């Protein structure tokens with residue numbers, strides 16, 4: 024079968040659990056679409072009631088920051104009449120505002136502006152849907168696909184630059200505050216039975232090195248690449264190429280969302296993370312299988328310096344096998360970041376700069392995560408992971 028009609032293999036990660044991930048493979052003739060712009064994509068997807076098996080082939084570049092006549096939209100198109108960046112900056116300057124949460128006119132205007140862009144860039148993917156790139160140049164630019172439904176396949180697409188024109192200042196996000204934006208390339212919001220395979224995720228033509236610092240903090244226009252939240256479950260992400268981006272993959276959005284316990288069952292394999300700063304993945308609660316992934320970066324990079332690969336968040340149950348990390352000068356311990364409530368990590372065959380390490384032991388963590396993955400394909404020797412992943416990961420590698 025072609026990419027449009029293929030299903031997730033019955034052994035291929037958590038996505039294969041129970042009813043598995045078949046997407047729109049069973050689509051009838053009238054439910055197979057070819058789309059080349061935002062209008063056609065939105066028409067094909069329809070509403071949440073569009074649950075018939077459907078296949079959507081993406082042809083070329085789809086820019087999501089466009090109006091109904093496909094005219095490009097920018098800051099001034101989305102801007103609320105009351106919003107002004109200069110006045111926003113002046114209002115919430117820590118020097119005069121202090122560390123209280125931004126409120127009042129400019130913040131309210133910024134929030135409205137953000138909702139204006141959200142209406143264009145964010146689209147929900149309905150149940151029983153396969154979306155695949157045709158050829159080697161299928162792209163979604165500025166878009167944020169959200170999956171709240173069951174049984175969705177996304178393959179062979181380059182996702183670029185999920186860009187938020189209205190980053191929000193949070194003075195208490197970290198010791199010196201932070202700017203936060205809203206759009207991921209893909210957000211799995213309670214979605215189940217999902218396969219994301221052979222996609223590419225990057226910051227397109229607007230990497231973070233092109234954004235200024237305000238209040239000494241990066242004016243961050245991006246959020247996640249592939250995030251999963253709110254009871255998201257039974258997901259396989261394989262052969263994806265994540266590059267040139269800050270916060271990649273956050274699974275479990277809050278320490279307070281204890282209902283995520285027993286969920287966030289995600290398998291990550293054969294993914295490439297190049298010049299990714301952090302969260303690859305950052306996990307709360309979930310039984311996450313991380314195997315045969317390749318990580319490469321520099322702690323001294325001027326654009327996207329490496330911070331950590333795996334985030335051991337609250338009650339996380341990461342099971343890691345034969346992953347390869349290439350970051351000059353990095354210690355075994357610093358391959359991961361351990362957050363409050365994170366106490367356990369199973370990792371075997373981890374290679375750091377060509378040397379076998381034990382990331383869990385290096386961080387004093389328990390080696391027991393209380394599970395062993397049964398749903399997986401063949402496991403590559405760590406020695407072959409770098410080559411296999413560079414060769415095979417990302418969009419334009421099949422077609």
Ligand SMILES: O=C(O)[C@H]1O[C@H](O[C@@H]2[C@H](O)[C@@H](O)[C@@H](O[C@@H]3[C@H](O)[C@@H](O)[C@@H](O[C@@H]4[C@H](O)[C@@H](O)[C@@H](O[C@@H]5[C@H](O)[C@@H](O)[C@@H](O)O[C@@H]5C(=O)O)O[C@@H]4C(=O)O)O[C@@H]3C(=O)O)O[C@@H]2C(=O)O)[C@H](O)[C@@H](O)[C@H]1O
Nearest residue numbers: 196197201203205212246247250252270273275276277305
């Ligand atoms: O109405 C809507 O549009 C939605 O509403 C609901 O969702 C909220 C929120 O609106 C979403 O944007 C989203 O956000 C998540 C977190 O709430 C948010 O703080 C952030 O989180 C991550 C990370 O989890 C967090 O710990 C922190 O990271 C720190 C630090 O800030 C970093 O600088 C770094 O040092 O790492 C630290 C760390 O790892 O701990 O900030 C992170 C970040 O991305 O900046 O982003 C989260 C995310 O993107 O998922 O979800 C919220 C939620 O409650 O789920 C509603 O859920 C949704 O359905 C919509 O309707």
Ligand SMILES: [Ca+2]
Nearest residue numbers: 196201202203
């Ligand atoms: Ca943050």
Ligand SMILES: [Ca+2]
Nearest residue numbers: 203204246247
């Ligand atoms: Ca976020």
Ligand SMILES: [Ca+2]
Nearest residue numbers: 207246247250
């Ligand atoms: Ca997000």
